[PDB]
């Protein structure tokens, strides 16, 4: 009796689902190369200076301590260094079909912005490269303005004050972004629920799964079944499970979108 | 405004 992911892909089709929000996490990053920076086996902490716990990278009083840590992701994770794959190509697809409400991501890499999801369609929870601002006299910059000191290694200085320029990162105990709060709207209006590459272990994005009306699909997309869609199962939900590529690569193939995505992903590569 | 996490 439960629903096949078919059975979502032709109400995606039919537009019977057409208001779908979208979350995400690490294992749409992972693909295009990323660092898994969230896994404390990543190499990333082989190179890390001396960093006591994983955690403390985005800790405020540990980045005042030794901002160092921080700034070596930053350096990796900069824009221009990593480009969108076809997960978030299917993202971009589902917007540009008008079928999209929100993409909320965990992620802080701006794949989803590079796809070209304009930013009304987009909750970067974790934050931004694209912006930074001061940690003393609170002036802010285009990420371009620390550019140079990032990719040479330099802890970016504010001209005005000395204080170190931080990337506007949500760190642990800060407010989340504003834009966050959309969930309030947001979920309640979906009438699709797609979670794909999360493990959804991060609050409190991973509750947000429960926030969607009971009658609606919830469509998990990862390599394993996460918690909280299973330990509340509701009726709707399908588990599309393995390789988060190929998982997209069986939706793109059942809405029978392969040749627009071709089409899409053709028309983008030149930017990048 | 609610905490990361
Ligand atoms: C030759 C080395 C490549 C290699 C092999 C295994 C890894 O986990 C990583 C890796 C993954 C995520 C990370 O965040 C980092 C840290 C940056 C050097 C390494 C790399
Ligand atoms: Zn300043």
Same mark, same amino acid.
């Given at each position: 009796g439960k629903l096949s992911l078919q059975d979502v892909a032709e109400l995606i089709r039919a537009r019977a689902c057409q208001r779908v929000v979208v979350m995400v996490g690490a294992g749409i990053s992972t693909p295009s190369g990323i660092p898994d920076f969230r896994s404390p086996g990543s190499g990333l902490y082989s190179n890390l200076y001396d960093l006591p716990y994983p955690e403390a990278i985005f800790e405020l009083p540990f980045f005042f301590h030794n901002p160092k840590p921080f700034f070596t992701l930053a350096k990796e994770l900069y824009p221009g260094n990593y480009k969108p794959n076809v997960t978030h190509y299917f993202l971009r697809l589902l917007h540009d079909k008008g079928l999209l409400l929100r993409l909320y991501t965990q992620?802080?890499?701006?794949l989803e912005r590079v796809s070209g999801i304009p930013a009304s369609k987009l909750v970067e929870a974790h934050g931004t490269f694209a912006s930074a601002t001061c940690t003393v006299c609170q002036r802010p910059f285009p990420g371009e303005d620390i550019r140079a000191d990032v990719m040479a290694d330099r802890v970016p200085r504010c001209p005005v004050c000395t204080g170190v320029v931080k990337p506007d990162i949500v760190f642990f105990g800060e407010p989340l $972004?504003? /834009?966050?709060?959309?969930h309030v709207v947001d979920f309640p209006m979906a009438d699709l629920l797609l979670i794909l590459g999360t493990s959804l272990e991060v609050e409190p994005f991973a509750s947000?799964?429960?926030?969607? /009306? =009971?009658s609606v699909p919830r469509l998990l997309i990862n390599r394993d079944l996460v918690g909280p869609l299973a330990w509340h $199962? /509701? =009726?709707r939900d399908v588990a599309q499970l393995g390789d988060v590529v190929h998982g997209v690569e069986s939706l793109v193939e059942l809405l029978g979108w392969t040749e627009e995505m071709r089409d899409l992903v053709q028309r983008e590569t030149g930017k990048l | 405004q609610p905490k990361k996490x």
């Open positions: 992620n802080i890499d701006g $972004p504003q /834009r966050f709060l959309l947000l799964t429960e926030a969607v /009306r =009971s $199962p /509701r =009726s | -």
